Amino acid sequence: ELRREMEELSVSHDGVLIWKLSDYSRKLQEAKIRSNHEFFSPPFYTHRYGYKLQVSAFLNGNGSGEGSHLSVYIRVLPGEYDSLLEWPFSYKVTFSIMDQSDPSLSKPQHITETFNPDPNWKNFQKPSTLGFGYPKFISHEEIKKRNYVRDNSVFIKASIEIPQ
Amino acid sequence: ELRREMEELSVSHDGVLIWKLSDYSRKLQEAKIRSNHEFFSPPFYTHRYGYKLQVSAFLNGNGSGEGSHLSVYIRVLPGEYDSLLEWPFSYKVTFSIMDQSDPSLSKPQHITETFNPDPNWKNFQKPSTLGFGYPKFISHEEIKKRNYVRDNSVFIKASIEIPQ
Amino acid sequence: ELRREMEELSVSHDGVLIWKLSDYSRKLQEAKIRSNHEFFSPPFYTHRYGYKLQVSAFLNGNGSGEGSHLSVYIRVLPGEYDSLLEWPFSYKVTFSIMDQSDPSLSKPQHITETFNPDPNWKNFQKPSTLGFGYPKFISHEEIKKRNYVRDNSVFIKASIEIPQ
Questions:
Q1: How many CA atoms lie within 13 A of A107 on its CB side?
Q2: Fewest beta carbons less than 10 Å away: which of A26, A59, B100, C163?
Q3: Three-state SS for A116?
Q4: How many angstroms separate the Cα of C101 from the Cα of each of B118, C79, C146, C155?
Q5: Of B3, B18, B147, which has the smallest distance from its Cβ to A49's Cβ?
Q6: C-alpha span between A122 and A141 (Å, rounded)
Q7: Which helix (H) or strand (E) holds C6?
Q8: Distance from CA of A85 to the nearest CA of B (A)
Q9: b/e string for A128-162 if b means 16 or more Cβ within 10 A?
Q10: How many pairs of residues across A and B have Cβ atoms under 8 Å apart?
Q11: Which of chain B's residues have a Cβ under 8 Å away from the Cβ of A5?
């Protein structure tokens, strides 16, 4: 299956995944209709034979962010190499929404959060489903400022700290 | 035909290929019927524009391992960049069958062999195929111990030492 | 689109792209009929979420190389991450045509040029399309010497200097 081996060559470079959401305005409008409308990133591996992770977003917010914020979560997926890895998952995760301006002409102001995975979080235990994240990661009023939206797309970056 | 350029994106990370054989028990029973039943790994490159190598296994053994051992071999394949490389192939190769237990929760005991390629080995000369390996790499009695089989799959790792 | 996501997994290793042109003699003969016959490399990214570049060649030459030289150019393509990058593009580019002989049995003599991108070059500005290069990169008389052609193929290498 060429789709299935498509997914196995999805690996983060130095632990970094950048998820591009294009056609933001059309996707936001759909999210504002659907009460729990969640977009999912392509699966990515932390390192080559490591953990399979996936990022998701609620363009019109989840929980306390509903109607006011973009909510961002990450979750562990069942991976082909899980029985070789340490459990529970515990690498520190950092979320960013990118300020899309030229780093030479200004200093971009990315919005960033970082957490250390909770050892009791069910999803961070060895897969055999609720992801961890930020319901109020960035508000609709803030994402309209600077260049968090540009050419009608947004960039979510997830970066995992690998001890190497 | 996207499969062939799927193959050109198969590269080892730092010289390392991990080959997952799933559904071990059904594959073993087929191997116990067919006298020389050989499974082949996906091709992988040593480094980015390097040598194309391939691992193979006889789940019910080859030669002196027939009926008692898993036999593991590696071979050089014709690669798209061969005329740029040094010949014969000579990087040291290390085979492992992985003990699939949690490295924090225990200390996995992987079984490992390593060889230095023989310069007279016909397959290690420049291609336009007998692979080199171990007929008695691990016995049927040993693979049933610890976690060399887990969730009905086994992991063969091939590691190539790149001088860089 | 599996062809479109084929392209997003095309990245240079340490900034390096090697473009193999096989069936050189048939392609050259076509080039000698078509006055401005240009072959294009697969797109490649400088680094993981970096600039999308593309190499091209005129097997029977372009401009002052027409009829006598292989001409080589590079150009910036619209990339999925452009608004995250510095503009104009400015990493130094190095072109090579590889002498395809064994580096242990001989010392290969690759032909090499290198330039620093001109800040006023229209193609090196942020895309919303003329590439920069060498019309007389290597002459038909020189490419017939040593092993610049071997097994009826040639290797063009482009290497980008990434500051990291």
A1: 1
A2: C163
A3: coil
A4: 22, 36, 8, 12
A5: B18
A6: 33
A7: helix C2-8
A8: 6
A9: eeebbbbbbbbebeebeebbbbbeebbbbbbbbee
A10: 32
A11: 6
Question: What three-state secondary structure class fits A29?
Answer: helix
Structural tokens at position A136: 């109020």
Q: Which of A3, A9, A102 sits opposite C87 (nearest CB)?
A: A102
The one-letter code for the residue type at C32 is K
With beta carbons under 8 A apart, name residues in chain A contacting C85: 102-103
Q: Is A151 on the interface with C (CB under 8 A)?
A: yes
DSSP state of A106: S
Interface of B with C in 67-96 (CB under 8 A): 80-81, 83-87
> Under a CB-based contact definition with an 8 Å cutoff, are residues C3 and C40 in contact?
no
How was this model experimentally determined? Answer: X-ray
Angstroms from B134 CA to nearest CA on chain A: 24
CA distance B152 to B21: 9
Say how far apart CA A52 and CA A7 lie, in whole Å: 10
Write out chain A residues lying below 8 Å of C84, CB-based: 98, 100, 155
d(CA C15, CA B11): 16
The first and second tokens of residue C4, run together, are 């479109």
Please tell me what resolution, in angstroms, this structure has. 2.7
Under 8 Å CB-to-CB from B79, ≥6 apart: which residues? B45, B50, B51, B52, B85, B127
Q: What is the 3-state secondary structure (H, E, C) of B71-123?
A: EEEEEEECCCCHHHCCCCCCCCEEEEECCCCCCCCCCCCCEEEEECCCCCCHH
Tell me which chain B residues have a C-beta less than 8 angstroms from the C-beta of C19. Answer: none
Closest CA to A36 of A135, A113, A122, A133: A135
Structural domain boundaries in chain A = 1-164
Q: What is the DSSP string of C74-120?
A: EEEE--TTGGGS-SS----EEEEE---S-TTTS----EEEEEPPPTT
Distance (Å) from the alpha carbon of C75 to chain A's nearest alpha carbon: 20
Query: Nearest 5 degrees, angle CA B134-CA B138-CA B143?
Result: 155
Q: Cβ contact (<8 Å) for C20 and B48?
A: no
Instruction: Name every residue whose Cβ is closer than 8 Å to that of residue B147 and which is 6 or more positions away in sequence.
Output: A83, B99, B100, B101, B108
Is C105 touching A (CB cutoff 8 A)? Answer: no
Nearest Cα residue to A126 out of B19, B153, B108, B100: B100
